């Protein structure tokens, strides 16, 4: 469960980052 | 403008980690006393996660999804920067200049990088960063 939650948080962060990007 | 910033994805072209993909944690454009040239503090993947097929068991998938990281001070001339970016909040200031002066700090930093990179890989995002370059 903790591994799945960490993966979901990382995916949400990636989606938010993509939205904000779019002489010697 | 400048492209060698934080979260920039590059390819290492020289040294032991040649051909590996790294993300720039910190750019040092003006150099330091130890490295008097434009360089970067980067974190990358030494051993990539293996390919996962649809008939593998959960234990085999968990075994093959492991990532071995590394951290590096690297010259700008030994990097090939790419248009890809990799933005991870867990890698913010994970390494600095005196991290590389103590072996235990390197181990703790590599533990943090391994955890963050495995979370991002299990998310399914940024697949180009976790696939190896073929050359």
């Amino acid at each position: 469960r903790q591994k799945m939650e960490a993966a979901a948080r990382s995916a949400a962060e990636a989606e938010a980052a993509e939205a904000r990007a779019e002489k010697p | 403008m400048k492209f060698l910033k934080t979260s920039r994805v590059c390819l290492v072209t020289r040294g032991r980690y040649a051909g590996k993909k790294v993300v720039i944690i910190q750019p040092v454009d003006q150099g330091t006393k130890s490295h008097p040239y434009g360089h970067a503090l980067v974190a990358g993947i030494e051993r990539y996660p293996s390919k996962i097929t649809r008939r593998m068991s959960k234990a085999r998938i968990e075994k093959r999804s492991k990532i071995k990281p590394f951290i590096k001070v690297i010259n700008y001339n030994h990097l090939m920067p790419t248009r890809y970016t990799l933005e991870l909040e867990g890698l913010k200031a994970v390494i600095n200049a005196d991290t590389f002066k103590e072996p235990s700090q390197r181990e703790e930093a590599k533990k943090t990088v391994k955890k963050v990179l495995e979370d991002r890989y299990n998310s399914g995002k940024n697949r180009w960063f976790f696939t190896p370059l073929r050359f």
Partner: protein, 95 residues
């Protein structure tokens, strides 16, 4: 005409001649124009084009060889690629 513009940039503006200095200029992001000779190796040409695309720098493909590009710059040595950092009094950037 590009030779006359280049001579004006050598007289007034600021340039760096050569592959390593051109790459350093592109990394710094203060490079205004890149000139690549015709007989530059295709791998180095693709590398310079990728660097200039990532830094948003215009690229001019000079139709002469590196000998001709060095002569156009007014040097007695060849030059496969060069970077204009300051246009000076020329209008080489307006194209």
């Amino acid at each position: 005409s590009i030779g006359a513009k280049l001579a004006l940039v050598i007289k007034s503006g600021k340039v760096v001649l050569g592959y390593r200095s051109t790459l350093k200029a592109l990394r710094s992001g203060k490079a205004k124009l890149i000139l690549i000779a015709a007989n530059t190796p295709p791998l180095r040409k693709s590398e310079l084009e990728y660097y200039s695309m990532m830094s948003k720098t215009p690229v001019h493909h000079y139709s002469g060889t590196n000998i001709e590009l060095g002569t156009a710059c007014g040097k007695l040595f060849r030059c496969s690629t060069m970077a204009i950092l300051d246009a000076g009094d020329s209008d080489i950037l307006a194209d």
